[PDB]
Design a protein around this ligand. Structure first.
Ligand code: EH9
Ligand code: ZN
Length: 349
């Protein structure tokens, strides 16, 4: 039985980490692309994980299935559409899905990703394709959907395209910019290509979020907040190692996109310490619960709610509260943000 059987709001989930094994297998076979297994069940076992992995072991997971979807228009649009259906089964009423448009392209994209051969799908089209999938999905399944394009910490040369992409496709599902990738890459937060892109995001009113504090120190979080001027933090668990940064962030009602289950499987969180979210709760912090990558973590939104309910004493009043904050922190136009809030209020009370 669902841990929290009411409407939910999800702000931190990767499109390329939320694909149906079947769909991966389908395109794998239909377009001759080598694939570990050939049975959906076995496929999820190899792609899924249940024990922390090194960055490399983890990254490798993508080389596995990405070549199957990347470059194929049909597949890009489809996984987008199928992702909305997955969310509907979760009882999610609003969701912000993110992904790197360059990682699904095989044209333009400088270092062509996944040892993919030069193709015809550019990053710009990837975005428009995804927009349609997400849009038809919203129509058919009843879930409000917005998207966020990610910049990659190791490739600042893409960041400007990313912000221009968010600018060119706004309203049209794209509501913000993000920064994902290796946090340990020394100085990555300050790469001129990244800071300029977020600076442009500010000049153009493009909402900002950043993956910081998941593995890197509190300083990675600081740079995210003070230099990139982020409005939301992806994870941000290590913020707690700097009480003044933490106190200030609490002061400014900063939003933390928490991924409980995710943190446990990646090692970002060691089961010997009290999970960072438990203190966020005790501190009445502005945060939300997210799946991050259902595919790799073999989960569903419930997985995370089950985890905090069972192992962290999370009440219902808390679930409703954190979801209310998720709505309040959404990148939706105030206009539509109020409408989401009324939905949840009348549904929670
Ligand atoms: C090692 C990551 C390289 C390929 C990234 C694909 C994808 C994007 C950025 O949505 N992504 C999905 N989940 C991700 C995660 N937890 N951390 C970084 N990137 C992630
Ligand atoms: Zn993430």
């Amino acid at each position: 039985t669902p841990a929290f059987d009411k409407p939910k709001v999800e702000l931190h989930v990767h499109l390329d980490g939320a694909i149906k094994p079947e769909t991966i297998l389908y395109y794998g076979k239909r377009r001759g692309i080598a694939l570990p297994a050939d049975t959906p069940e076995e496929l999820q076992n190899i792609i899924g994980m249940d024990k922390p992995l090194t960055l490399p072991d983890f990254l490798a997971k993508f080389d596995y299935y990405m070549p199957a979807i990347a470059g194929c228009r049909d597949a890009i649009k489809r996984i987008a559409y199928e992702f909305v259906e997955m969310k509907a089964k979760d009882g999610v009423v609003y969701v912000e899905v993110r992904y790197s448009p360059h990682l699904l392209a095989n044209s333009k994209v400088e270092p062509i990703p996944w040892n993919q051969a030069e193709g015809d799908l550019t990053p710009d089209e990837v975005v428009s394709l995804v927009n349609q999938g997400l849009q038809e999905g919203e129509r058919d399944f009843g879930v409000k959907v917005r998207s966020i394009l990610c910049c990659m910490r190791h490739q600042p040369s893409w960041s400007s395209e990313v912000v221009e992409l968010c600018k060119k496709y706004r309203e049209q599902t794209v509501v913000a910019i993000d920064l994902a990738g290796d946090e340990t890459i020394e100085g990555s937060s300050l790469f001129p290509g990244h800071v300029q892109a977020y600076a442009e995001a500010v000049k153009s009113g493009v909402h900002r979020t950043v993956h910081a504090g998941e593995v890197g120190s509190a300083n990675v979080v600081k740079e995210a907040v003070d230099t990139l001027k982020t409005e939301r933090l992806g994870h941000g668990y290590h913020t707690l190692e700097d009480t003044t940064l933490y106190n200030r962030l609490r002061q400014e009602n900063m939003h933390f996109e928490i991924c409980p289950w995710s943190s446990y499987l990646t090692g970002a969180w060691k089961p010997d310490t009290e999970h960072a979210v438990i203190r966020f709760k005790n501190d009445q912090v502005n945060y939300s619960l997210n799946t991050d990558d259902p595919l790799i973590f073999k989960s569903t939104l419930d997985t995370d709610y089950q985890m905090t309910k069972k192992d962290m004493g999370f009440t219902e009043e808390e679930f409703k509260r954190l979801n209310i904050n998720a709505a309040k922190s959404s990148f939706l136009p105030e206009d539509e943000k109020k409408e989401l809030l009324d939905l949840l209020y009348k549904a929670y009370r």
